[PDB]
């Protein structure tokens, strides 16, 4: 079991360098669109309180160069949907996959294509966290890369990158330009809420190891959904729903483990530990996986 | 930090099937060359000892099918190179990269697409075992999927997949179809020799970790190569060498940290475990990012 991602070539294909005065970062370009995080158009001086119409007013098509690796695309109009700066440019893109526009929630999964001056860089997996920041791999001008999932020859575009929050993790926007939580793209003391552990992933993944090799932290017992969420809360992990239980319904047909014969299990570990034990080579339970992605691999 | 591949578009659009009799598996479509495992010609009585050179000489082109997504390639010429198949068809590939075929040595890494029947299923990244294994992700079907690295521009293929071994780790050829390790293309009783850890990506990654801001477990001591090896081997570390000494020397001089001073770090890391702590996210000790990896993400 790995943490995979999905193929990234039809989404390299739309990835552009969006220039705005001295300031660099990516673009994604679809049909004649190209979208990209709204503060390209802050400067340095206005960072602190950045007035966004205004700036955006005062800007001219001319004022952004958008270039797709060595070809200049020349940018015909200019708008703002929320957090988002769309482009109008003079050519579709053609190489424009079949696509959606979604805004997914905290938990659930997604490849994200890294990106550096309009190019393709590395790509891996990331969830969304209960907190909604990512915990990406994301330096300096990273801003307007993108996350995605595929379902079958479309892709379903859910993230772009816009700011790094000071205990380095990444905060972002959906393709219409609205945050994930509850952040601002400006210069700010603002600082990612307390995190918690995403049960059902967890669980999820314990499903993972048994269809593998890995079944020693199994046992006799089951427990109730009412004591399991008490432990949970005491660990700082999500609730775990009813609607968590459906989800993992074929895992648990799949092996002989009820989801809450699998709560006593993980509430066993959440206590007395691993034991020096190890679950599919990790010493930590890993909560990025969701009960999609198991089935999806293995 | 993340275990980041490279973007797969440029190897997504070489992957086609390739069927020969019951046994369909991926090839790799450059030029107008499909290379694939040539344990495709194998038939299912055929599988503990093989005669390839036999089989295939009773092969004609039209028992080679080759498909492209939903176009059939024509073979019109076929060829053996150590245990890879080698395809001539009809059309060159039009998507052909810039590429090269690259044998590695246990340590290095690089990103695989795995495939099943010629199409993408999804990208992780990947590292060469001291043992010349692969603790890879694959399912029946996967043999044919390649291994491979893009620094600038050219994709660098350096492995294909080819079988799983008992302990459900992974042997492959490089792109000449000589294996890595002691392995053949036959159903045997062979296994994985006892695997160590690299010791030089060890190593490695704790650097990465100080520069992404993480001191706590260094200390005031040294330590000499020769004692660090003797101490290291107890814990079944790959030895470390005058070679690695001088690969880790820019990662030295970034962080003023002397290799031999970060030697005596995992001395102690070893003797005392992480004490409920995690580095760069994890708890255990990583050792599938090289030196190189380090200074591309970082
Ligand atoms: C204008 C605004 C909203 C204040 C801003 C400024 C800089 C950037 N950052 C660009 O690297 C970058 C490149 N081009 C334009 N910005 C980085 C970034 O977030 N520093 C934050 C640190 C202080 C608080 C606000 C910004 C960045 C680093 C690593 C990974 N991700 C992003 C993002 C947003
Ligand atoms: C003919 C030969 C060399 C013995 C062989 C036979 C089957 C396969 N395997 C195919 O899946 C497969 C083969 N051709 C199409 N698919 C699987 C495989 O290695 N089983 C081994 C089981 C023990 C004995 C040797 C083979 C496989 C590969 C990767 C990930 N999981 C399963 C590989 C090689």
Same mark, same amino acid.
């Not at 079991?1 to 193929?7: C, D, E, L, S």
């Not at 990835?15 to 995080?37: E, S």
């Not at 895992?251 to 020096?276: H, P, Y």
């Given at each position: 079991?790995?943490?995979?991602? *999905?193929?990234?070539?039809?989404? =390299?294909?739309?990835?552009?360098?969006?220039?705005?005065?001295?300031?660099?970062?990516?673009? +994604?370009?679809?049909?004649?669109?190209?979208?990209?995080? #709204?503060?390209?158009?802050?400067?340095? =001086?206005?960072?602190?309180?950045?007035?966004? &119409?205004? +700036?955006?007013? #005062?800007?001219?098509?001319?004022?952004?160069?958008?270039?797709?690796?060595?070809?200049?695309?020349?940018?015909?109009?200019?708008?703002?949907?929320?957090?988002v700066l769309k482009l109008k440019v003079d050519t579709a893109n053609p190489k424009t996959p079949k696509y959606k526009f979604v805004r997914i929630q905290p938990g659930q999964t997604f490849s994200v294509l890294?990106?550096?001056?309009?190019?393709?860089?590395?790509?891996?997996?990331?969830?969304? #966290?209960?907190?909604?920041?990512?915990?990406?791999?994301?330096?300096?001008?990273?801003?307007?890369?993108?996350?995605?999932?595929?379902?079958?020859?479309?892709?379903?575009?859910?993230?772009?990158?816009?700011? &790094?929050?000071?205990?380095?993790?990444?905060?972002? /926007?959906?393709? &219409?330009?609205?945050?994930?939580?509850? *952040?601002?793209?400006?210069?700010?003391?603002?600082?990612?809420?307390?995190?918690?552990?995403? /049960?059902?992933?967890?669980?999820?993944?314990?499903?993972?190891?048994?269809?593998?090799?890995?079944?020693?932290?199994?046992?006799?017992?089951?427990? /109730?959904?009412?004591?399991?969420?008490?432990?949970?809360?005491?660990?700082?992990?999500?609730?775990?729903?009813?609607?968590?239980?459906?989800?993992?319904?074929? +895992?648990?047909?799949?092996?002989?483990?009820?989801?809450?014969?699998?709560?006593?299990?993980?509430? =066993?570990?959440?206590?007395?530990?691993?034991?020096?034990?190890?679950?599919?080579?990790?010493?930590?339970? =890993?909560? &990025? *996986?969701?009960?999609?992605?198991?089935?999806?691999?293995?």
């Open positions: 079991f790995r943490k995979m991602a *999905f193929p990234s070539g039809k989404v =390299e294909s739309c990835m552009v360098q969006v220039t705005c005065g001295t300031t660099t970062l990516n673009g +994604l370009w679809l049909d004649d669109v190209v979208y990209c995080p #709204r503060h390209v158009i802050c400067t340095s =001086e206005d960072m602190l309180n950045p007035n966004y &119409e205004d +700036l955006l007013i #005062r800007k001219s098509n001319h004022n952004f160069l958008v270039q797709a690796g060595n070809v200049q695309l020349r940018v015909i109009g200019h708008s703002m949907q929320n957090c890294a990106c550096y001056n309009g190019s393709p860089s590395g790509v891996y997996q990331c969830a969304m #966290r209960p907190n909604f920041t990512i915990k990406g791999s994301f330096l300096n001008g990273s801003c307007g890369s993108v996350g995605f999932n595929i379902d079958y020859d479309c892709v379903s575009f859910c993230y772009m990158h816009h700011m &790094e929050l000071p205990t380095g993790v990444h905060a972002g /926007t959906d393709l &219409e330009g609205n945050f994930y939580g509850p *952040f601002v793209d400006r210069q700010t003391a603002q600082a990612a809420g307390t995190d918690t552990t995403i /049960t059902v992933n967890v669980l999820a993944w314990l499903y993972a190891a048994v269809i593998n090799g890995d079944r020693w932290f199994l046992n006799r017992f089951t427990t /109730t959904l009412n004591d399991f969420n008490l432990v949970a809360m005491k660990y700082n992990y999500e609730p775990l729903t009813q609607d968590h239980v459906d989800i993992l319904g074929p +895992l648990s047909a799949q092996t002989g483990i009820a989801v809450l014969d699998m709560c006593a299990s993980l509430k =066993e570990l959440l206590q007395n530990g691993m034991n020096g034990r190890t679950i599919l080579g990790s010493a930590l339970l =890993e909560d &990025e *996986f969701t009960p999609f992605d198991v089935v999806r691999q293995c």
